[PDB]
Amino acid sequence: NTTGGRFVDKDNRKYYVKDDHKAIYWHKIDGKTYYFGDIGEMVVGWQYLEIPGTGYRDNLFDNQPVNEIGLQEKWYYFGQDGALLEQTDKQVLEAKTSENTGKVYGEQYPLSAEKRTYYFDNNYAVKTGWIYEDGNWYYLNKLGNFGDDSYNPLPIGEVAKGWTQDFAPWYYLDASGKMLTDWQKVNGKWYYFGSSGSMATGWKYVRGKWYYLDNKNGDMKTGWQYLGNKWYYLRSSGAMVTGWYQDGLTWYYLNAGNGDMKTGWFQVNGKWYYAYSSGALAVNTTVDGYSVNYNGEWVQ
Numbered sequence: 001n002t003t004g005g006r007f008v009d010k011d012n013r014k015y016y017v018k019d020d021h022k023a024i025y026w027h028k029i030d031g032k033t034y035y036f037g038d039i040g041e042m043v044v045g046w047q048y049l050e051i052p053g054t055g056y057r058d059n060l061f062d063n064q065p066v067n068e069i070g071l072q073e074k075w076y077y078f079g080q081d082g083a084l085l086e087q088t089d090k091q092v093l094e095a096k097t098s099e100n101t102g103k104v105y106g107e108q109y110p111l112s113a114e115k116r117t118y119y120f121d122n123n124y125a126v127k128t129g130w131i132y133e134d135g136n137w138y139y140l141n142k143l144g145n146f147g148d149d150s151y152n153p154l155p156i157g158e159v160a161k162g163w164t165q166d167f168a169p170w171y172y173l174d175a176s177g178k179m180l181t182d183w184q185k186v187n188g189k190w191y192y193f194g195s196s197g198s199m200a201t202g203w204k205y206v207r208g209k210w211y212y213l214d215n216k217n218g219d220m221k222t223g224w225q226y227l228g229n230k231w232y233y234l235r236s237s238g239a240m241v242t243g244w245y246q247d248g249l250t251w252y253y254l255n256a257g258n259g260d261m262k263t264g265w266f267q268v269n270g271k272w273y274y275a276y277s278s279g280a281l282a283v284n285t286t287v288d289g290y291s292v293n294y295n296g297e298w299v300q
């Protein structure tokens with residue numbers, strides 16, 4: 001693509017000069033790809049740059065008009081010689097930090113960070129999103145942090161850990177980035193991630209039992225829960241109860257199918273029972289005149 005010029009050392013930097021003009025941005029020179037930024041300085045190592053190939057940031061020299069278009073940006077790695085790493089699969093590289101990113105030929109060595117595995121797309125840019133590796137799903141960040149002036153792209157392409165949203169469904173990656181599935185206890189509470197990994201919220205039927213995960217935060221509930229102007233009792237295991245349930249000495253009746261707590265007179269196998277407005281089963285007394293025995297049965 002670019003020819004007739006020659007690399008030059010000057011002012012502690014490396015430039016590519018052709019006819020007294022410093023190349024800028026993306027250039028392909030004799031089988032290798034380089035990036036010279038907005039004024040010519042040759043880059044090395046980790047770089048967050050506008051994507052190449054369009055023409056708006058390619059084959060340009062400081063003696064030319066630069067289109068105001070603001071192109072998408074992604075991470076790229078350049079060798080210490082400024083040559084782009086044309087990887088389409090994976091590479092072990094040092095964790096992107098503030099010290100080892102955006103540097104240029106002529107600057108001192110960064111500061112060791114820690115080696116990590118980075119995956120790449122078919123155009124040599126760091127890959128983002130979900131990936132399945134060695135039997136597990138990992139989420140490679142697609143977004144950076146904050147906005148405009150204080151925007152931070154460092155997180156992009158990194159393996160996510162802990163609670164993470166996918167832009168929104170929530171997921172939880174373990175200490176090594178592994179996405180959890182099914183029942184998992186996190187911070188002492190239970191969560192159900194099903195088989196796809198997305199966090200369940202609200203009511204969920206799992207293995208023949210009903211459970212209620214916080215409609216917002218997803219954490220499994222237990223004990224008495226007032227849901228939808230109805231009471232339900234969830235065992236310590238979280239599983240919903242149906243039928244008779246004794247809390248202390250007080251009895252309650254959870255609807256045989258839906259599970260909601262009953263109040264008022266109700267029948268169970270022909271026999272009549274009465275529950276107060278709190279659910280407490282009436283026993284050995286009279287209810288509006290009708291006698292109820294020790295089992296709460298309406299006797300004559």
Ligand SMILES: C[N+](C)(C)CCO
Nearest residue numbers: 130137179196197198
């Ligand atoms: C793990 N994935 C999120 C990619 C699968 C469910 O869509």
Ligand SMILES: C[N+](C)(C)CCO
Nearest residue numbers: 163170216217218219
């Ligand atoms: C991040 N979540 C709200 C999904 C977890 C509850 O702490």
Ligand SMILES: C[N+](C)(C)CCO
Nearest residue numbers: 183190236237238239
């Ligand atoms: C069955 N759960 C996974 C909900 C917890 C009981 O230990």
Ligand SMILES: C[N+](C)(C)CCO
Nearest residue numbers: 203210240257258259
């Ligand atoms: C457990 N159920 C989902 C059936 C009751 C709430 O509608």
Ligand SMILES: C[N+](C)(C)CCO
Nearest residue numbers: 265266272273290298
């Ligand atoms: C006769 N009882 C009122 C006790 C039964 C509900 O119909």
Ligand SMILES: C[N+](C)(C)CCO
Nearest residue numbers: 224231261277278279
């Ligand atoms: C036992 N309950 C929580 C259902 C009654 C309080 O009114």
Ligand SMILES: C[N+](C)(C)CCO
Nearest residue numbers: 244251281294295296
């Ligand atoms: C189970 N009951 C609530 C019906 C009474 C004890 O037999």
